[PDB]
UniProtKB/Swiss-Prot annotation, chains A, B:
Keyword annotations: DNA replication, DNA-binding
Gene Ontology process terms (BP): DNA replication; rolling circle single-stranded viral DNA replication
Pfam family, one: Phage_DNA_bind
Gene: V
Keyword DNA-binding among record annotations: yes
Subunit comment: Homodimer.
Listed GO MF terms: single-stranded DNA binding
Cited Gene3D superfamilies: Nucleic acid-binding proteins
Taxonomic classification: Viruses, Monodnaviria, Loebvirae, Hofneiviricota, Faserviricetes
Record protein name field: DNA-Binding protein G5P
Site residues (Involved in DNA binding), renumbered to this chain: 16, 21, 26, 34, 46
Length: 86, 86
């Protein structure tokens, strides 16, 4: 299991906006977190939230299976990192 | 944890070859596996092995932390799916 931590300082998201190729508006909410990848300290990683979802609260989390998909070359890829409480 | 299975029929790898941009030869060994992504059946996924590593034997495996890296846009990515016995 991947250990992810939202620190007290990372309890908010920011929003980016724009317009798609054929005219539709979009909004993306992004939040930062720390993920332990086995180096001397955890590293900073950007998470993009799914529509209608609030910011994850501070605490420990792991990665949900729905984060992954098979890509166009037949290898596993991360679609969006989706988190669940540890 | 991601459940990965190498079936008896997937016990071998195949090798692709070529030449890099500036003249170096390369060889890539690829093996197939089944990964449970929570749908009605596991799906077929291609794994590229690391240099000097044999094919994984049939059995159950999970994903090692070294499979992941932070990409150039600051989000988590899979580098290469690296497996360890379950």
């Amino acid at each position: 299991m991947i250990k992810v931590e939202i620190k007290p300082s990372q309890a908010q998201f920011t929003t980016r906006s724009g317009v798609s190729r054929q005219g539709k508006p979009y909004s993306l909410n992004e939040q930062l977190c720390y993920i332990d990848l086995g180096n001397e300290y955890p590293v900073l990683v950007k998470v993009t939230l799914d529509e209608g979802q609030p910011a994850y609260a501070p605490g420990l989390y792991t990665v949900h299976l729905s984060s992954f998909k098979v890509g166009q070359f037949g290898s596993l890829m991360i679609d969006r990192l989706r988190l669940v409480p540890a």
